[model samples]
Target: GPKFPRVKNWELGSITYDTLCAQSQQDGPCTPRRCLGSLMLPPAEQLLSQARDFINQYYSSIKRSGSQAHEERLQEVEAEVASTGTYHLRESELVFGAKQAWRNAPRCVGRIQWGKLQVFDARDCSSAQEMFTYICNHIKYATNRGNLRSAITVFPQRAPGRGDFRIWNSQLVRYAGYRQQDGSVRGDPANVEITELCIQHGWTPGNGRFDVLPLLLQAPDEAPELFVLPPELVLEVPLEHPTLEWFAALGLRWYALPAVSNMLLEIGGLEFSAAPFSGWYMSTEIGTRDLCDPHRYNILEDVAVCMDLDTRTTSSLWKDKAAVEINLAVLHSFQLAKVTIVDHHAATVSFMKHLDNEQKARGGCPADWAWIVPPISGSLTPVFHQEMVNYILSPAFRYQPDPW
Candidate 1:
């Protein structure tokens, strides 16, 4: 209790000493001065030590630790690095490393499904065209025709003397946000800058709310090339409610796959700038944050107005009523469309089991409390009552500087 982080669950009266955090070789924003666990952003190393440690981790995962091949592989890494300043991860190593990256992610609440990821090795990709082709294939594979599967396409790593292979846009698929003449955003307010960047790159911009942005694939020191995604490849779920007949006429829809394309994947000190990952969405993430957040779509008042709720008074709980209906609509729509999605309660309940599982296995789980808990219903969830130790672990995925 004095040494390791002691985590407590208020509701269950359970306590666990997190000895797994001792394995953390990396530091985070929290220090002796303050604990920065709630903040969204916090913002490297002995390569051989990392490489050897990762190789050791990889071997342990395959149940071949301390064998001749393991020792020889460790030796091979050092010898290669002794001459080249940088070495490459083998296909098997990259697969293990990528999965570990997801496992080590402190922000993701969807870590329970980490092992089932399909790792697509795209290290051999040479140009922007090949990158686009790879991404389209990744989308098709991950979307699974609305049956959403988790996948990551690993483009080439950051070389010592070469520019990194990068995806300029944050996510592989996102709606365009155009700023109108009145200084208000048209679509998603989050994507305004990126949407404009897409237009600047010779794209025939669609003047609408749901326009799919093109891929800004950058191959090393070359100019970023734009490639539009095929419409059918992007399977969208048109939002609708079960009982509210008016909800169907709102014309609201969202893309199926939440494929984040801009985060850098670091494995054994090697950085892969364009490792785009995807997974099924939690219903609240779409309904609460994306749709109802005041800065985002802000459809709460719209729904409330349609439902004839009193918006004039805070005591009426109009916002709460509208949000729940919107959340219900999201769940119903996704279920109706046969798309994979988890609701807030189900996800939070699963997270408790995840915490228990990690306690038995690693003695701790690095998790951002703010992120681990759902944005809307915080106290209603088990995770809100459970304390978590937030810290970064590797191999891990990281948000990089905009390549624009």
Candidate 2:
């Protein structure tokens, strides 16, 4: 049997040997037919099993009994796999599966609107140009002026031997990072690689901190192409304090939508490698992680100094005070801009209610405590004391390999 490395998801903070192997036995199963040396079953079979479980769960969630249609659908899945070595999801199943994937996302605390997500099916697209069009439409639709809407555009699924369609950019909206000769990154450090890729593909990189990265669209068996986003399509909020005029002089701004690309959307046995999803920004995601993280903007010290805080010592809690004010500015700015954004406190409270609803609806909710807790204030939030169990659920959105 061939041995495989364990799958590790940093977001969920869990590792498993393989889906089928973990599901079959507590430790693992070792058999001649089921086990190919050290390998468990074929990848296709494992996917089939996961798909079956997902379909069953979907039916159960809706309180629908397994009728002849369900049985026929299952048989159709098996028959398709036998004939084509893969299967495709019906349009209805894809819609349901997309929502379920969001609901099953452990790291996302904003799952209360999971059912309201708009799913765009672009599985029939066969060219990078088509992919670019789909992505542009996604941006235009998701960015609805200042009012962001949650949406996803799903492209083709991965076949047994064919290449998968993929979006190379981490998110639909991101700043371009340019490495300077002095070893300082000019823009977002996280986007340095993507920025270089865009340059190599003939895009003229910008020096601004808020320059939106163009889409690197890759169709199966074709070279990746770059598509510049329309300026009006991406809604951005200029940061400012409610009372402090100096805050606006800081020249800080952030995009309204957080559209995640490069994540695989698994529905039943089918894996859509190019499913890009978006949600309205949570304030902490920008104020705490993006702007405050050391690898990111790292503006706490400057902001504290601007606010006339004593930065002489760490015990003075200057960073803490600056961070709170920065977060307040983010909330204040978004509200003034009339954009959709949730504060950490309100988002977590809604999540607590979501958990209660899920407990009554689906036994329990899958959540990652590390992500559920706010980055700024952990103990103050109710989710900090709440217990959580993290597990893989089918009809899931998962991180996949970079399509370079």
Top TM-score prediction, candidate number:
1
* lDDT, candidate 2, 1-404, per-residue tens: 22533444344464433322222211223354664322322176886776677667666666674977777778888888778778778887888999988987878999888889998989899998898888889888887887788999999899877888989999988998899999999879999999999999999988898899998998888789889988888889999998878999999999898999989998876888999999898898999899999999899999999989889999989999999999999999999999999999899889988876776666567676777889999877877867665555667787787887
| True-structure RMSD, every candidate | 1.6, 7.4
| Top-scoring candidate (lDDT) | 1
Worst 10 residues of 2 by lDDT: 19-28
TM-score of every model versus the real structure? 0.97, 0.89
How big is the RMSD of model 1? 1.6
Q: Write down the lDDT of every candidate, Cα atoms only.
A: 0.90, 0.82
- Per-residue lDDT tens digits for candidate 1, residues 1-404, read 36887889999998889887888888887778887665667502399999989999999999999999999999999888888887899999999999999988988898888888999999999999999999999999999888888999999989877988999888988989999999999999999999999888899888887888888999999999989988889999999999999999999998888999989999998999999999999999889999999889999998999999999999999999999999999999999999999998899888888878888877888888888889888899888999888877789998788986
